[PDB]
Amino acid sequence: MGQVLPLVTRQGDRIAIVSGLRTPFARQATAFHGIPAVDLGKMVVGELLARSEIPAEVIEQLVFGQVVQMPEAPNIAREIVLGTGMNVHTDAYSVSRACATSFQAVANVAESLMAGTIRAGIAGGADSSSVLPIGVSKKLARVLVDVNKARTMSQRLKLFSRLRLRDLMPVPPAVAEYSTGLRMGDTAEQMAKTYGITREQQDALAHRSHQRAAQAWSDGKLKEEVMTAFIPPYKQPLVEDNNIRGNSSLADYAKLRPAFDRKHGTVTAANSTPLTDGAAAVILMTESRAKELGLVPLGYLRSYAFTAIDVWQDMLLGPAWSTPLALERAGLTMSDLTLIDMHEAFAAQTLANIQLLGSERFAREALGRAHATGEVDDSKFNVLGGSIAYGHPFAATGARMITQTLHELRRRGGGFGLVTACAAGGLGAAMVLEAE
Amino acid sequence: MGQVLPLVTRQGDRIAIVSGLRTPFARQATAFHGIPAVDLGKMVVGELLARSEIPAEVIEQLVFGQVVQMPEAPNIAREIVLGTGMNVHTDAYSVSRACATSFQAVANVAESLMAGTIRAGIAGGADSSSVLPIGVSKKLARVLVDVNKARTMSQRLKLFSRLRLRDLMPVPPAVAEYSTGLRMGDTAEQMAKTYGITREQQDALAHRSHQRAAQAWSDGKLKEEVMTAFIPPYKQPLVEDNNIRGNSSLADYAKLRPAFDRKHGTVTAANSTPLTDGAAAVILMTESRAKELGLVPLGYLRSYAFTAIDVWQDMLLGPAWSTPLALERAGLTMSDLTLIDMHEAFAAQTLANIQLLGSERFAREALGRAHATGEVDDSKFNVLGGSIAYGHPFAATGARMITQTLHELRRRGGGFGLVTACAAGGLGAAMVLEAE
Amino acid sequence: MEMTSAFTLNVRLDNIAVITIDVPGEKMNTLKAEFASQVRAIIKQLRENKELRGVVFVSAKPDNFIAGADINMIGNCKTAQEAEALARQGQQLMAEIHALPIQVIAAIHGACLGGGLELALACHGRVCTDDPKTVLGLPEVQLGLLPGSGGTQRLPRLIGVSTALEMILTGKQLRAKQALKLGLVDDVVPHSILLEAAVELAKKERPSSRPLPVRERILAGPLGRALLFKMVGKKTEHKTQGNYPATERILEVVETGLAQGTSSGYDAEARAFGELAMTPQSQALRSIFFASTDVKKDPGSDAPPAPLNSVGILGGGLMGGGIAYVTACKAGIPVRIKDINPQGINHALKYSWDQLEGKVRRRHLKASERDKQLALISGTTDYRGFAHRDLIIEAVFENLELKQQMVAEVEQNCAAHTIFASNTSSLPIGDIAAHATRPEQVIGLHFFSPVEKMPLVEIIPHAGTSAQTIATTVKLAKKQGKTPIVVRDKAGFYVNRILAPYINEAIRMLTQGERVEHIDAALVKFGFPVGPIQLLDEVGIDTGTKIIPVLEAAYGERFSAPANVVSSILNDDRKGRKNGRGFYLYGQKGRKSKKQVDPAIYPLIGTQGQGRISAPQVAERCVMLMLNEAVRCVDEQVIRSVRDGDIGAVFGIGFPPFLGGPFRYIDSLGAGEVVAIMQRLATQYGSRFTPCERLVEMGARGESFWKTTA
């Protein structure tokens, strides 16, 4: 039986996506310096409702996730409601799923309102690589846990005797997988060594995206969904992402030493997303409620998929696994797709995906499917540039694809957009857009 | 069905709940000292899986969460899949919601099960109050960011030239609300002051909470929910909860100083729940899946409710607000409710809740309902005592008391129990159990 | 009964008696002679059935513990003896209550003002609720009156004189936290347990342990008291200039209370209260206070207003931020700014940031409160979200065609029920409206120099203006904590209309070789704060000319300003503080002196010869022009009410309050005598001093101004 998942409520009303907005991104240690992601989330949502001009009492639930979780506020989602003028009775709680939090954040909200518990929901995500919650060593932590529970004053000095010169040094954060110890590019590099990804073609897509990227601001189409940041110093507002360098040469890309595998690696800073800071959020709210209160939804939702696979090898193939699941749930075809989009985590992993998406054998045996997913048409593939351009604010990466996709499909006929993204820990996520 | 909503899946099969496990709760220093929260889940889940006739491949998604969070492994549930011997293709996933993470994670699995996305899953939460993360001063966090991004050695000495004052010692964690500055027990004093609850009106409920529970261990009625903790040192295995003190007289701990007010503090430490260590996991998986693999469900579910209220005055009424929603969603009545139980985080407050539960005025105006939700029967209320005894692990207390409820309802041979818990930030939950 | 005996007593089951304070007249718990009368009956009844733990006092009203002593009966007093005896009966009654040997508790909730503190000083145990609404204060020096009943000498007895005296001289509001910190109130408790917490303290018997002062206030009487008294008196005379009574009298009554005993202070307090009750400045302040209450109680428009929840601001900048800062921080209403330049958005947001930043820099407000207050501020450059703004205010340039452009776009790009407010300075409101779909929803809000300084604004409707629009406007300004006054839609409106002659003749005299010291001292000594030239420095010489050209176009040469001075200053740009390079330069060495004067301005100005006459001659001529114009505007009734006219001049411009306002002053000056004064100056100087037609009409007949004034 065709495993199709009709995403409609008990009443049969389908799920609507009225609007959303993205905070403009800045590099690490840039205009978003010393700005907690909570503040970035606060400003965007308050403006978003102001831009949405809809009553706040309509919103019935909001969920916000965070990459690089911060200690002071465990559930930052509730903090936003307290931080903003949002009604307190709004059921705010936080989640965490790798870099696919945005995909996760909408999913649990959508199914909840698909079950019919609520009528209006808010999903969003943000991260700030400029600010780091750097902590002390584990051994020093246990000692401090011991000293506060210590009862005798003379006990503390003996309890403080165990010390080392390296104990005082704070531990820098790491990006390599906890259970694997390999960085994300390390997974891409071996796949680049596996399926064959030369740096020149890895650099070529970076040129293609960058030219598409600067042209986008040159065209200025990414204006109605991107805010202009205002900073408490109020020296000057920010309008555009600093990361996009659309005036570049492919030769310039080739003049970088490989980062991870400095011997045979075909990935550099040029063909890898850098650490950027930003925020984004999207309103999730059913078509019946939208029609009841009179709004036009910026498209709809058709289907979605999530997948977990092995972390040791082929860890960034998640969308390839998730894509047939999303397509089968959507009951659609790769041909039945106006635009196709995937998160450009690395140039090495990306080209392998299109190769593997068209790989008949792999889908035949690894997925067990009858046929391969198909060949990715570059014309509809990442029309507005991609992640090798804007940057990687982690959580906001999902929404930034969503906004452009709905607008681009709004710029065209209804059609069907495709949004997919890989994640650490062998996690895959996929989603299918209607856009009417 | 204007208030009652079915909780039956798309296929017409009711939602079964199966036997679960609780790590025996231990105080923050007596036992589980130095034990993280992640491994606590590893043993309880590993033994819970090796407790019933289900193989590991049956489970399809496990959702955990922790109120106290570690910077490493933001999705702790992934390491649960990875660290244990488990299907590496199970949808590992983590959430965060203070004092009700267990309830929300249970809801997440259920709503995932509502559409039929997941047919077998584990919902739970991990909590360890011996491995508290200790962060550095916030001023010495961007300097660390700056020195990490520092280029020349001359800039670092200029950057380090500013270090002075009390930036050296770390910042201890605080229980006070981030935007309210309330220590979560000071707000209990004022409610007792607001609603006039005597320290001797309480401190006997604490006795009857300490009682009926030391009997439960003596009767061993709660043996089937709790494993025998094994410590990696293996100095001794732990089976009975150490926090419980169901032997002191009601007048034995009434001779204690006030906790917060210290001037009118009708509540103290003895009549407040103490923080302990533990974890819980319950097999959530539908009726048809249970039936077809041959496993008896540990009861069923009728309805549930989650509610948020303004955290400025009497914010711990969440269960009181949540309760009528759970009953109306179940289409049931407080009278038609065999056995109830409470999170019993503090003396008073709940006494105010039952006072407010039976208070016709409050539901008349605060909830708009034509009638109060009604009073409670003490015999049907904390039959086995409760949190004033066993302990309060944030992510573990939730799942614990449903497991004790169902088996006691099994000892009562049916009926409809009720489980409620209050959460910080004006958050509350209610859920209606059907033990067939 | 209990209506007359507002101190309804009740002995509980224990040995504690509770006394309520519920005057049936109004929610304010005021003091009446009957209340002073029946309390003697109650205290005698309290003497009955002795041998009890103690007594307590309660607010018994959710708003205030006690309003204070009524002044209408004080105004009914005639001579010193009535006021002296009135103090004496107050002096004796407080000590009589203080004469009790048992513990007396004043459990106070809400406002406790005026005579309540005197009562509070009598009670041995004082406890107050924790609500921000409660406060302690002696508000009578602001009225030009001393509250002499024993507390004026018990408070310096109770608390160090270093703070007691400034309290008397600067009668203000004290937080419960502050009072407990210095020890005025024994303890602070929540309102729910306010009554019960007093019970155990009342049962606790005779805490015979008087807290010691700072030990630096023991100088009262011995060496130091005169040094303190000399320093405060000299500083006060340096401050108040001596034209305000009830300042030296405090120093006398405090000294005799301190250095000569409580009885010596008692008799002086009675005597000083008597001689001072009829001081002309006293009823001047009392009458001024009356109109302030009247306008506060005034609802403005008689039509019911409309709900107000969202407001829009067109344009931005420092001037735009002033409305934005107040609307969020004071009114607490969402506001949207539409400056096309983000810098205009950036500037206005920066301004409101700086305004709130200093508050937190003083630790006056929490950092989260700033974020909470910053939440009400929203800026953009489009009309999105403006579709649901009930009111819109323009902070844009005063181009008329642009103004009619502004009304069209806001009408096109907002709601239909919404009303519009115009912050104009020159253009008439109906002229501004001209072609408008709903001109009745267009209202004129003449704002001023930084609005957070002066709370006065002008309400300027035009031919077509819905009364509800005013009603919304009147409620809004009051909801903004401001002073709305309906001003006839006339050229110059009211304030700037009458302000032009002020600096006009001043420049005319200044052109005739007047020095900075003579012109400055003349006006400031005559109860006018901030002299003209420094006023022009701060308001801006560029704005100093304002729109005075239309004044000649509207009302002839009467507003004509002398030439070759505005020209001589516009060319060599000297705008005061707008350019910073006014004739009062800043950045002087030490920065602890008066704003220095340029020597080069005098050649730049005509500076004809040398200065002549005296400060009164300058003062008398300057003032009468406002008077000649103040009667002029009310002659055509630019202002609806005489008290409304008087209150605006005395409060907005800075007319000497001790003169009671110009209408009081002309009533104080009486009749054609002042009219006769202003023809001789016309003859000796020029025809700018022509009398007003009503001014002779009222002056010659001896007509009064404050209704039945004379």
PDB file of C-alpha atoms in Angstrom, chain C residues 540-656:
ATOM      1  CA  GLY C 540      17.411  77.410  20.177  1.00  0.00           C
ATOM      2  CA  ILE C 541      17.862  80.817  18.571  1.00  0.00           C
ATOM      3  CA  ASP C 542      16.954  79.164  15.269  1.00  0.00           C
ATOM      4  CA  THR C 543      13.671  78.354  17.003  1.00  0.00           C
ATOM      5  CA  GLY C 544      14.000  81.638  18.896  1.00  0.00           C
ATOM      6  CA  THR C 545      12.522  83.449  15.920  1.00  0.00           C
ATOM      7  CA  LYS C 546       9.947  80.607  15.816  1.00  0.00           C
ATOM      8  CA  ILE C 547       7.117  81.644  13.448  1.00  0.00           C
ATOM      9  CA  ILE C 548       6.868  85.230  14.712  1.00  0.00           C
ATOM     10  CA  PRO C 549       6.596  86.622  11.123  1.00  0.00           C
ATOM     11  CA  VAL C 550       2.987  85.414  10.955  1.00  0.00           C
ATOM     12  CA  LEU C 551       2.367  87.230  14.241  1.00  0.00           C
ATOM     13  CA  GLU C 552       2.778  90.581  12.498  1.00  0.00           C
ATOM     14  CA  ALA C 553       0.734  89.196   9.609  1.00  0.00           C
ATOM     15  CA  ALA C 554      -1.985  88.189  12.076  1.00  0.00           C
ATOM     16  CA  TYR C 555      -1.909  90.888  14.771  1.00  0.00           C
ATOM     17  CA  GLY C 556       0.192  93.688  13.334  1.00  0.00           C
ATOM     18  CA  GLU C 557       3.220  95.516  14.718  1.00  0.00           C
ATOM     19  CA  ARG C 558       2.338  94.551  18.310  1.00  0.00           C
ATOM     20  CA  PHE C 559       4.471  91.440  17.759  1.00  0.00           C
ATOM     21  CA  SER C 560       7.069  93.205  15.597  1.00  0.00           C
ATOM     22  CA  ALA C 561      10.571  92.314  16.585  1.00  0.00           C
ATOM     23  CA  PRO C 562      13.525  94.679  16.109  1.00  0.00           C
ATOM     24  CA  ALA C 563      15.604  94.121  13.008  1.00  0.00           C
ATOM     25  CA  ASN C 564      19.365  93.547  12.531  1.00  0.00           C
ATOM     26  CA  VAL C 565      19.469  91.123  15.461  1.00  0.00           C
ATOM     27  CA  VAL C 566      17.750  88.022  14.092  1.00  0.00           C
ATOM     28  CA  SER C 567      19.694  88.802  10.922  1.00  0.00           C
ATOM     29  CA  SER C 568      22.879  89.401  12.937  1.00  0.00           C
ATOM     30  CA  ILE C 569      22.516  85.998  14.625  1.00  0.00           C
ATOM     31  CA  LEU C 570      21.174  83.781  11.818  1.00  0.00           C
ATOM     32  CA  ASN C 571      24.102  84.713   9.559  1.00  0.00           C
ATOM     33  CA  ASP C 572      26.690  84.041  12.288  1.00  0.00           C
ATOM     34  CA  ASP C 573      24.952  80.876  13.410  1.00  0.00           C
ATOM     35  CA  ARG C 574      24.577  81.142  17.195  1.00  0.00           C
ATOM     36  CA  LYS C 575      21.649  78.918  18.169  1.00  0.00           C
ATOM     37  CA  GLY C 576      22.465  78.394  21.840  1.00  0.00           C
ATOM     38  CA  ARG C 577      22.521  74.619  22.198  1.00  0.00           C
ATOM     39  CA  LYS C 578      21.223  73.610  18.755  1.00  0.00           C
ATOM     40  CA  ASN C 579      24.699  74.309  17.379  1.00  0.00           C
ATOM     41  CA  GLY C 580      26.302  74.312  20.834  1.00  0.00           C
ATOM     42  CA  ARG C 581      28.010  77.584  19.906  1.00  0.00           C
ATOM     43  CA  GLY C 582      25.559  79.920  21.565  1.00  0.00           C
ATOM     44  CA  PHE C 583      26.654  82.988  23.459  1.00  0.00           C
ATOM     45  CA  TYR C 584      26.702  80.564  26.410  1.00  0.00           C
ATOM     46  CA  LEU C 585      29.696  78.437  25.458  1.00  0.00           C
ATOM     47  CA  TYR C 586      30.238  75.108  27.202  1.00  0.00           C
ATOM     48  CA  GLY C 587      33.378  73.198  28.082  1.00  0.00           C
ATOM     49  CA  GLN C 588      34.617  75.964  30.372  1.00  0.00           C
ATOM     50  CA  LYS C 589      37.481  75.263  32.757  1.00  0.00           C
ATOM     51  CA  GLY C 590      36.185  73.645  35.932  1.00  0.00           C
ATOM     52  CA  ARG C 591      32.634  73.633  34.529  1.00  0.00           C
ATOM     53  CA  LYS C 592      31.395  74.933  37.896  1.00  0.00           C
ATOM     54  CA  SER C 593      30.330  78.465  36.968  1.00  0.00           C
ATOM     55  CA  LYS C 594      27.486  80.265  35.234  1.00  0.00           C
ATOM     56  CA  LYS C 595      27.279  79.926  31.462  1.00  0.00           C
ATOM     57  CA  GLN C 596      29.843  82.418  30.188  1.00  0.00           C
ATOM     58  CA  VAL C 597      28.786  85.287  27.923  1.00  0.00           C
ATOM     59  CA  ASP C 598      30.535  86.164  24.691  1.00  0.00           C
ATOM     60  CA  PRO C 599      32.076  89.638  24.496  1.00  0.00           C
ATOM     61  CA  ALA C 600      31.612  89.639  20.720  1.00  0.00           C
ATOM     62  CA  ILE C 601      27.810  89.349  20.811  1.00  0.00           C
ATOM     63  CA  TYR C 602      27.448  92.961  21.971  1.00  0.00           C
ATOM     64  CA  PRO C 603      29.134  94.298  18.794  1.00  0.00           C
ATOM     65  CA  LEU C 604      27.135  91.715  16.831  1.00  0.00           C
ATOM     66  CA  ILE C 605      23.922  93.111  18.330  1.00  0.00           C
ATOM     67  CA  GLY C 606      23.226  96.816  17.869  1.00  0.00           C
ATOM     68  CA  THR C 607      23.972  97.530  21.551  1.00  0.00           C
ATOM     69  CA  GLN C 608      22.778 101.120  21.380  1.00  0.00           C
ATOM     70  CA  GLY C 609      24.648 103.122  24.003  1.00  0.00           C
ATOM     71  CA  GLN C 610      24.480 101.872  27.578  1.00  0.00           C
ATOM     72  CA  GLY C 611      21.851 100.310  29.793  1.00  0.00           C
ATOM     73  CA  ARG C 612      19.539 102.500  31.841  1.00  0.00           C
ATOM     74  CA  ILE C 613      16.597 102.215  34.282  1.00  0.00           C
ATOM     75  CA  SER C 614      16.349  99.452  36.886  1.00  0.00           C
ATOM     76  CA  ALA C 615      15.276  95.829  37.095  1.00  0.00           C
ATOM     77  CA  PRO C 616      11.698  96.709  38.214  1.00  0.00           C
ATOM     78  CA  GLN C 617      11.357  98.961  35.167  1.00  0.00           C
ATOM     79  CA  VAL C 618      12.455  96.051  32.981  1.00  0.00           C
ATOM     80  CA  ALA C 619      10.261  93.698  35.006  1.00  0.00           C
ATOM     81  CA  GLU C 620       7.154  95.893  35.002  1.00  0.00           C
ATOM     82  CA  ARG C 621       7.257  96.521  31.256  1.00  0.00           C
ATOM     83  CA  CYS C 622       7.973  92.925  30.249  1.00  0.00           C
ATOM     84  CA  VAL C 623       5.270  91.485  32.506  1.00  0.00           C
ATOM     85  CA  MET C 624       2.499  93.861  31.439  1.00  0.00           C
ATOM     86  CA  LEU C 625       2.928  92.872  27.782  1.00  0.00           C
ATOM     87  CA  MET C 626       2.118  89.290  28.717  1.00  0.00           C
ATOM     88  CA  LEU C 627      -0.697  90.692  30.852  1.00  0.00           C
ATOM     89  CA  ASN C 628      -1.789  92.921  27.968  1.00  0.00           C
ATOM     90  CA  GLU C 629      -1.654  89.833  25.757  1.00  0.00           C
ATOM     91  CA  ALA C 630      -3.052  87.425  28.361  1.00  0.00           C
ATOM     92  CA  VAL C 631      -6.175  89.558  28.662  1.00  0.00           C
ATOM     93  CA  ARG C 632      -6.091  89.916  24.872  1.00  0.00           C
ATOM     94  CA  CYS C 633      -6.293  86.190  24.128  1.00  0.00           C
ATOM     95  CA  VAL C 634      -8.985  85.649  26.756  1.00  0.00           C
ATOM     96  CA  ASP C 635     -10.711  88.793  25.456  1.00  0.00           C
ATOM     97  CA  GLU C 636     -11.551  86.759  22.350  1.00  0.00           C
ATOM     98  CA  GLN C 637     -11.626  83.730  24.689  1.00  0.00           C
ATOM     99  CA  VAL C 638      -8.756  81.806  23.128  1.00  0.00           C
ATOM    100  CA  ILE C 639      -8.986  79.874  26.407  1.00  0.00           C
ATOM    101  CA  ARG C 640     -12.412  78.654  27.495  1.00  0.00           C
ATOM    102  CA  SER C 641     -12.101  79.355  31.236  1.00  0.00           C
ATOM    103  CA  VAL C 642     -10.451  82.054  33.323  1.00  0.00           C
ATOM    104  CA  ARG C 643      -8.936  79.463  35.661  1.00  0.00           C
ATOM    105  CA  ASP C 644      -7.836  77.465  32.613  1.00  0.00           C
ATOM    106  CA  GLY C 645      -6.246  80.649  31.311  1.00  0.00           C
ATOM    107  CA  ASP C 646      -4.580  81.385  34.641  1.00  0.00           C
ATOM    108  CA  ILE C 647      -3.287  77.848  35.170  1.00  0.00           C
ATOM    109  CA  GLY C 648      -1.667  77.649  31.737  1.00  0.00           C
ATOM    110  CA  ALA C 649       0.312  80.864  32.151  1.00  0.00           C
ATOM    111  CA  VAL C 650       1.410  80.183  35.728  1.00  0.00           C
ATOM    112  CA  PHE C 651       2.380  76.575  34.954  1.00  0.00           C
ATOM    113  CA  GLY C 652       3.600  76.485  31.355  1.00  0.00           C
ATOM    114  CA  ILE C 653       5.523  79.703  30.811  1.00  0.00           C
ATOM    115  CA  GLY C 654       6.756  80.005  34.386  1.00  0.00           C
ATOM    116  CA  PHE C 655       4.776  82.852  35.885  1.00  0.00           C
ATOM    117  CA  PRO C 656       5.697  83.301  39.568  1.00  0.00           C
TER     118      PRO C 656
END
